[PDB]
Amino acid sequence: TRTYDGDGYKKRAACLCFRSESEEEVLLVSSSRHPDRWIVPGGGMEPEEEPSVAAVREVCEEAGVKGTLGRLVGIFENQERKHRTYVYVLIVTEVLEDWEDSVNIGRKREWFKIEDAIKVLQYHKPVQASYFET
Ligand SMILES: O=P(O)(O)O[C@H]1[C@H](OP(=O)(O)O)[C@@H](OP(=O)(O)O)[C@H](OP(=O)(O)O)[C@@H](OP(=O)(O)O)[C@H]1OP(=O)(O)O
Ligand SMILES: [Cl-]
Ligand SMILES: [Cl-]
Ligand SMILES: [Mg+2]
């Protein structure tokens, strides 16, 4: 069930999934519509679901990782698609071999240096590239 802010923006949460507390390498996943493209894992908040809980759930489902939830980076809007995403830091400590989206849609995941994550996100996901700006 999709959820919405009072202005009709779809509510989402995502994590920047870093290998370590150095925050030098981040985990991206393949787009569902266009698997040769990369995105930051994330998705819709469920009814009454805390944003931090949605963020951790979505990255388990999409990226097959778990770890130590860190700070909220910020809340980011996509004007064209009308959604508003809470973006958290997650320090990955568990990498699961088979995860929901690997099994269901053959979703891929890959580690990127921050500068390379920004590069591959820029064309189709410039707001997600902006997650990294600070
Ligand atoms: O229309 P697309 O380009 O395929 O994009 C879709 C769409 O995102 P937009 O809202 O930016 O269009 C989905 O959202 P809904 O249509 O379900 O509201 C989203 O699902 P989430 O917001 O829950 O992530 C899904 O992404 P995914 O399959 O990664 O969950 C994402 O496709 P991509 O981001 O993979 O291209
Ligand atoms: Cl790192
Ligand atoms: Cl976006
Ligand atoms: Mg998603």
Give the Å distances, CA to CA, from 119 to 28, 113, 123: 12, 10, 8
The identity of residue 91, as a single letter, is: I
Cα-to-centroid distance, 79 and ligand 2 (Å): 30
Q: Can you give the residue ranges of every domain in the chain?
A: 1-134
Q: What method was applied to determine this entry?
A: X-ray
Of 75, 93, 94, the closest CA to residue 85 belongs to 75
Give the CA-trace dihedral at 30, 85, 79, 121, to 10 degrees: -30
To which residue do tokens 């994590």 refer?
15
Element (H, E) at 69: strand 65-78
Q: Is 2 annotated as a binding residue?
A: yes
Element (H, E) at 12: strand 10-18
- The structure tokens listed for 77 are 């809007």
61 is catalytic: yes
